[PDB]
C-alpha cells in the first residue's frame, strides 16, 4: 500500500533560465510545459537542479541568475502540484560541476559544514531558500564529502532536518511534510568515503538516492555497462574499497561482507547499503540513467563490451570530432560521450549502423556500431522491468533518475517505471531475473534467517559448527570451542532466529 517514490531531476542551466521560453527549443530544449499532467502524476518528486553554496557559505542561486525568471520557472513547476497532491518539487544543491573535488564551488561545501556556526548559517539558508521560492524539500548532491568532512556533513543534515521539521509544523504540512534527501554514491570507491558512518548519514533523510549509474565511462581501461543490475563474469571486476573502511570489524567480518574483487553493479551498491545496521531498505532509492555513455575505438567479437577503447576522458571534450554517428544533441552540446535516451531512440531508428543488443546477465541493453567501433551503455523500458522487480523484491523506497529532459517526447521511460510499480494489469511474477552474479556480502544489517540446534554448555564445537543462542545463529571460526557464543572472538554471528 506504500507508493514507490519516483524521483526525477529537472536540470536547467542559468543561461536558459535567464532566457526562459516555452516556444523555442533551441533556447530551452526542455521547458517546464513538456512535463504534462500525465507525467506530473507519474512522478512523486521533481528535483530542481542545481543551486550552489556560495563563498558566504550559504545556499544560493548562481549569482548570474535572473531572480524574476528563476521564480517564474519554479512557479511553473509548483503549479504542477495541481495535477497531483503527492507531488513534491525539491531543489537540489550541488551537482558534479559545483561540488566535485576540483569543482568551482568545492571549498564552500567543505567550509559550510565545518563548524557549528557555519552549519547553522548554511542550514538556515537552505530552508529560507526553500520557503522563499516555494520548494517542498532539500536535496544535497555533493560529490563527495571525504572521510574527514563527513562528521560535519552529518551534523549539517541533522540541523537541516530539525529546521525542516519546524517548518512543517509552522505550515501545517503533516500531510506532505518537507523532506530531506541526498544523492549518494552508487559505487564502492566513492561510497567508501562515508561508508563507515552510513547509518548516521541516512537517519535524517527521507531517502538516499543511490547514483547507481555512471559506473563505467571514459576513465576506465575497458568498456563496460554503466548500470548493470547484476554482474557478468566475462566483465571487468574491481577492488572492493569498502574492506579498507574504518569499521573496526574482524578479518572474517570484513571478508564475509566485502568480496574482492567484485562486480560493480546496481545490486552491489544496494546490498552494500543494506549490510549496514540502521540503514532501512525503505529509505534506499535506486538511481537510473535516462542517458547512455558512448565509447569509440572498440574491438569486435563481443558487441563492443569489455573492450579497450580510445574515448577521450578530458574536460572539455578536446576537439570537434563528434564521432557519435546520428547524435544531433552531441553536436549541439559539443560532446559525443553522452547521449540522451531520446536521442538514442532516433539513432537506432535511422540508418546510422547501430545494433541494439542485450546482455542477459546484466539485464541491460547496449548499442554496438560494428563498422566504426562504437559502444553505448544505456537503460530502457526493458532493463527497467528487472530494476523495478528488484526494487519491489528488496523493498526499496523507489527509483530516481537523471534526468527528465532525456526521456523521449512521449515520456516512455517514466511511464514504464510508473506502470511497473502501479499498473493493476502489469504482472512481473514470472519475469526471470537471470543468472548474473549477485553481491553476496553479509553484514550486521542483513543477516539471513537461519536455524540451528541450541548451544549447549560443555559441548566441544569443531570449526564451522552452527549453534543458536540468544536470538542468533553463530558459527565457530575454528575448533574446538566451548565458550558461549558472542563471549569471545571465536564465534561469528551469521544468522538470526525466529
Q: Which residues are catalytic?
A: 143
In the complex with ligand M6F, the residue whose CB is nearer, 248 or 316, is: 316
Choice from 4, 7, 8, 9 touching ligand M6F (CB under 6 A): 9
Query: Which region among 9-17, 128-136, 169-177, 468-476 touches ligand M6F (by CB under 6 A)?
Result: 9-17
Give min distance, CB of 461 to ligand M6F, in A.
Answer: 50
Alpha-carbon span 411 to 306, nearest angstrom: 31
Return the closest-CA partner of residue 401 out of 285, 228, 266. Answer: 285
The annotation status of 251 as a binding-site residue, yes or no, is: no
Give min distance, CB of 99 to ligand M6F, in A.
Answer: 9
The annotation status of 402 as a binding-site residue, yes or no, is: yes
In the complex with ligand M6F, the residue whose CB is nearer, 315 or 328, is: 315
Number of residues interacting with ligand M6F: please give it, by CB under 6 A: 16
Q: Residue 269 is placed in which grid cell?
A: 551498491
Interface mask toward ligand M6F for 314-333; x: CB under 6 A: -xx-----------------
Give min distance, CB of 139 to ligand M6F, in A.
Answer: 8
Give min distance, CB of 258 to ligand M6F, in A.
Answer: 24
DSSP H or E segment with residue 399: strand 398-402
In the complex with ligand M6F, the residue whose CB is nearer, 66 or 168, is: 66
Alpha-carbon span 43 to 37, nearest angstrom: 10
Alpha-carbon span 132 to 110, nearest angstrom: 25
Q: Is 481 a binder of ligand M6F (CB under 6 A)? A: no
The annotation status of 133 as a binding-site residue, yes or no, is: no
Give min distance, CB of 393 to ligand M6F, in A.
Answer: 24
Taking the CA atoms of 222, 142, 417 and 83 in sequence, report the sign of the dihedral they define.
negative
Alpha-carbon span 177 to 165, nearest angstrom: 8
Cβ-based neighbours of 252, under 8 Å, separated by 6 or more = 477, 492
Q: Within positions 86 to 145, which residues make up the interface with ligand M6F, using CB under 6 A?
A: 95-97, 141, 143
Cβ-based neighbours of 79, under 8 Å, separated by 6 or more = none
**Local structure of residue 326 (DSSP, 8 states):** T
Q: Is 338 a binder of ligand M6F (CB under 6 A)? A: yes
Q: Residue 88 is placed in which grid cell?
A: 513534491
In the complex with ligand M6F, the residue whose CB is nearer, 384 or 461, is: 384
Q: Within positions 238 to 277, which residues make up the interface with ligand M6F, using CB under 6 A?
A: none
For every residue of 68-102, DSSP letters joined together read HHHHHHHHHHHHGGGG-TT-EEEEEEE-HHHHSTT
Give min distance, CB of 225 to ligand M6F, in A.
Answer: 15
List strand residue ranges (DSSP E) for 166-242, in order.
Answer: 179-185, 207-211
**What is the SS3 assignment for 277-311?**
CCCCHHHEEEEEECEEEEECCCCCCCCCCCCCCCC
In the complex with ligand M6F, the residue whose CB is nearer, 338 or 388, is: 338
Q: Could you give the residue ranges of the DSSP H alpha helices within 86-220?
A: 96-99, 106-112, 116-133, 150-170, 188-191, 198-202
Return the closest-CA partner of residue 177 out of 132, 136, 139. Answer: 136
In the complex with ligand M6F, the residue whose CB is nearer, 49 or 307, is: 49
In the complex with ligand M6F, the residue whose CB is nearer, 292 or 485, is: 292
The annotation status of 213 as a binding-site residue, yes or no, is: yes
The annotation status of 212 as a binding-site residue, yes or no, is: yes
Q: Is 395 left (phi over 0), alpha (psi -120 to 50) or beta?
A: left
In the complex with ligand M6F, the residue whose CB is nearer, 8 or 326, is: 8
Torsion of CA 232, 236, 241, 244, to 10 degrees: 100
Q: Residue 293: what are its φ and ψ, rounded to 5°?
A: -105, 125
Give min distance, CB of 48 to ligand M6F, in A.
Answer: 12
In the complex with ligand M6F, the residue whose CB is nearer, 163 or 338, is: 338
Alpha-carbon span 255 to 102, nearest angstrom: 33
Interface mask toward ligand M6F for 155-184; x: CB under 6 A: ----------------------------x-
Interface mask toward ligand M6F for 197-236; x: CB under 6 A: --------------x--x----------------------
**Distance separating the N- and C-terminal Cα atoms of the chain:** 26
Q: Residue 351 is placed in which grid cell?
A: 540508418
Choice from 133, 262, 378, 402 touching ligand M6F (CB under 6 A): 402
The annotation status of 178 as a binding-site residue, yes or no, is: no
Q: What count of other Cβ atoms lies within 10 Å of the Cβ of residue 274?
A: 21
Give min distance, CB of 402 to ligand M6F, in A.
Answer: 4
Query: Which region among 5-13, 65-73, 171-179, 373-381 touches ligand M6F (by CB under 6 A)?
Result: 5-13
Give min distance, CB of 485 to ligand M6F, in A.
Answer: 44
**Local structure of residue 86 (DSSP, 8 states):** T
Return the closest-CA partner of residue 135 out of 180, 202, 201, 186. Answer: 180
Cβ-based neighbours of 61, under 8 Å, separated by 6 or more = 51, 52, 67, 70
Q: Is 298 a binder of ligand M6F (CB under 6 A)? A: no
The annotation status of 94 as a binding-site residue, yes or no, is: yes
Q: Which residues are annotated as a binding site?
A: 67-68, 94-97, 144, 211-214, 402
Per CB under 6 A, residues contacting ligand M6F are 9, 11, 13, 95-97, 141, 143, 183, 211, 214, 315-316, 335, 338, 402
Q: Which residues are annotated as a binding site for chitin?
A: 67-68, 94-97, 144, 211-214, 402
Amino acid at each position: 500500500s506504500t507508493r514507490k517514490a519516483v524521483i526525477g531531476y529537472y536540470f536547467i542551466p542559468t543561461n536558459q533560465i535567464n532566457n526562459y521560453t516555452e516556444t523555442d527549443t533551441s533556447v530551452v530544449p526542455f521547458p517546464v510545459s513538456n512535463i504534462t499532467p500525465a507525467k506530473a502524476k507519474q512522478l512523486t518528486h521533481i528535483n530542481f537542479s542545481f543551486l550552489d553554496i556560495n563563498s558566504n557559505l550559504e545556499c544560493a542561486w548562481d549569482p548570474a541568475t535572473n531572480d524574476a525568471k528563476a521564480r517564474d520557472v519554479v512557479n511553473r513547476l509548483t503549479a504542477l502540484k495541481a495535477h497531483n497532491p503527492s507531488l513534491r518539487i525539491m531543489f537540489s544543491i550541488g551537482g558534479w560541476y559545483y561540488s566535485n573535488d576540483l569543482g568551482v564551488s568545492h571549498a564552500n561545501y567543505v567550509n559550510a559544514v565545518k563548524t557549528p556556526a557555519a552549519r547553522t548559517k548554511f542550514a538556515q539558508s537552505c530552508v529560507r531558500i526553500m520557503k522563499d521560492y516555494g520548494f517542498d524539500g532539500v536535496d544535497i548532491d555533493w560529490e563527495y564529502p571525504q572521510a574527514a568532512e563527513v562528521d560535519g556533513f552529518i551534523a549539517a543534515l541533522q540541523e537541516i532536518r530539525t529546521l525542516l521539521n519546524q517548518q512543517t509544523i509552522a505550515d501545517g504540512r503533516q500531510a506532505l511534510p518537507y523532506q530531506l534527501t541526498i544523492a549518494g554514491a552508487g559505487g564502492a570507491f566513492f561510497l567508501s568515503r562515508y561508508y563507515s558512518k552510513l547509518a548516521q548519514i541516512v537517519a535524517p533523510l527521507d531517502y538516499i538516492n543511490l547514483m547507481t549509474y555512471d559506473l563505467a565511462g571514459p576513465w576506465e581501461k575497458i568498456t563496460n555497462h554503466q548500470a548493470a543490475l547484476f554482474g557478468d563474469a566475462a566483465g571487468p571486476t574491481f577492488y572492493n574499497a569498502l574492506r579498507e573502511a574504518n569499521l573496526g570489524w574482524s578479518w572474517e567480518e570484513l571478508t564475509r561482507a566485502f568480496p574482492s574483487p567484485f562486480s560493480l553493479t546496481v545490486d552491489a551498491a544496494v546490498q552494500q547499503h543494506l549490510m549496514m545496521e540502521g540503514v532501512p531498505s525503505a529509505k534506499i532509492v535506486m538511481g537510473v540513467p535516462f542517458y547512455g555513455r558512448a565509447f569509440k575505438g572498440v574491438s569486435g567479437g563481443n558487441g563492443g563490451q569489455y573492450s579497450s577503447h580510445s574515448t577521450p576522458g578530458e574536460d572539455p571534450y578536446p576537439n570537434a570530432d563528434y564521432w557519435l554517428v546520428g547524435c544531433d544533441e552531441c553536436v549541439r552540446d559539443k560532446d559525443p560521450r553522452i547521449a540522451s535516451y531520446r536521442q538514442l531512440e532516433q539513432m537506432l531508428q535511422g540508418n546510422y549502423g547501430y545494433q541494439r543488443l542485450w546482455n542477459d546477465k546484466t539485464k541491460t541493453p547496449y548499442l554496438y556500431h560494428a563498422q566504426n567501433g562504437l559502444f553505448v551503455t544505456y537503460d530502457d523500458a526493458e532493463s527497467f522491468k528487472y530494476k523495478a522487480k528488484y526494487i519491489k523484491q528488496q523493498q526499496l523506497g523507489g527509483v530516481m533518475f537523471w534526468h527528465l529532459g532525456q526521456d523521449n517526447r512521449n515520456g516512455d521511460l517514466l511511464a514504464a517505471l510508473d506502470r511497473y510499480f502501479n499498473a493493476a494489469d502489469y504482472d512481473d511474477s514470472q519475469l526471470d531475473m537471470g543468472t548474473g552474479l549477485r553481491y553476496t556480502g553479509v553484514g550486521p544489517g542483513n543477516l539471513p534467517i537461519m536455524t540451528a540446534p541450541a548451544y549447549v554448555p560443555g559441548t566441544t564445537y569443531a570449526q564451522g559448527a552452527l549453534v543458536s543462542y540468544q536470538g542468533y545463529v553463530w558459527q565457530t571460526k575454528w575448533g574446538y570451542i566451548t565458550s558461549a557464543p558472542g563471549s569471545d572472538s571465536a564465534w561469528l554471528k551469521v544468522g538470526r532466529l525466529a
